[PDB]
């Protein structure tokens, strides 16, 4: 569970993300595709080329969802219900892939928020992404 500290940390760092969430979402996807190519098996229908509008479009969607989880940090299971359902019933992404995205999301933030990406914030953000991942995967079986 996320502590008050964690919540402050996450709202703070995500606060800084601001209007760049979209671009950061897209960047995280690209890093994942390049480092963990097995993740591409879920996007056979996408142009995964550098600067793909599809990836760009997808990045915004993921960022918007994360932004929505920060906005409802005290009720994530409910704020994310719909997406939990989608992932469980349609997309059916294997759980291990969540940790790969999380990781690439951490890299992107680190690369963009040098001043806020402190040890403490890093830890809070990691626990956060783990929680989001747990929710999205909660209805799998």
């Amino acid at each position: 569970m996320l502590s008050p500290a964690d919540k402050t940390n996450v709202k703070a760092a995500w606060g800084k993300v601001g209007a760049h969430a979209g671009e950061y979402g897209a960047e995280a996807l690209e890093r994942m595709f390049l480092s963990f190519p097995t993740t591409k098996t879920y996007f056979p229908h996408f142009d995964l080329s550098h600067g793909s509008a599809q990836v760009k479009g997808h990045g915004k969607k993921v960022a918007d969802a994360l932004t929505n989880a920060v906005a409802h940090v005290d009720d994530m299971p409910n704020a994310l219900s719909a997406l939990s359902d989608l992932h469980a019933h349609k997309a059916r992404v294997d759980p291990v892939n969540f940790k790969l995205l999380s990781h690439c999301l951490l890299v992107t933030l680190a690369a963009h928020l040098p001043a806020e990406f402190t040890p403490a914030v890093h830890a809070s953000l990691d626990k956060f992404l783990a929680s989001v991942s747990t929710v999205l995967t909660s209805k799998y079986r």
Binding site: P37, T38, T41, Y42, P44, A88, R92, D94, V96, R141
Partner: protein, 146 residues
């Protein structure tokens, strides 16, 4: 694989007692049941709505036999699983879009089925050797992903 002559014999010998037909249909059905999300690649198979419906589905059974078949043939090339599954590896990547993690899930399911079947015979040391093979096979299948 990294199989000790002894570990090689243990694998080899148990396998000789395996009914590929039955084991393959069971491994694959159990996979679809324990890890429901694997059903994403078998929409065209039909009714997978229930354990009973999966285990009974003949499209499932027949696919199971084809999978164990190829697996079975791989045990003959334990010194080069990589070269043995190269084309199967490209196919799974390039045509099927199967996440290699699934290879791992099946491997584990496979081990549960063998235990299920051979009870006593499937000792800790025999499980160890099979674990190295399933790992080995999954690795070989994942090998040409890009």
């Amino acid at each position: 694989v990294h199989l000790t002559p002894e570990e090689k014999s243990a694998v080899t010998a148990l396998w000789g007692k395996v009914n590929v037909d039955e084991v393959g249909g069971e491994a694959l059905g159990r996979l679809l049941v324990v890890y429901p999300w694997t059903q994403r690649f078998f929409e065209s198979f039909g009714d997978l709505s229930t354990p009973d419906a999966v285990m009974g589905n003949p499209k499932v059974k027949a696919h199971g036999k084809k999978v164990l078949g190829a697996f079975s043939d791989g045990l003959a090339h334990l010194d080069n699983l990589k070269g043995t599954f190269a084309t199967l590896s490209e196919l799974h990547c390039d045509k099927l879009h199967v996440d290699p993690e699934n290879f791992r899930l099946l491997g584990n399911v496979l081990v549960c089925v063998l235990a299920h079947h051979f009870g006593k015979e499937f000792t800790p040391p025999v499980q160890a050797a099979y674990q190295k093979v399933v790992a080995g096979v999954a690795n070989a299948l994942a090998h040409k992903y890009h």
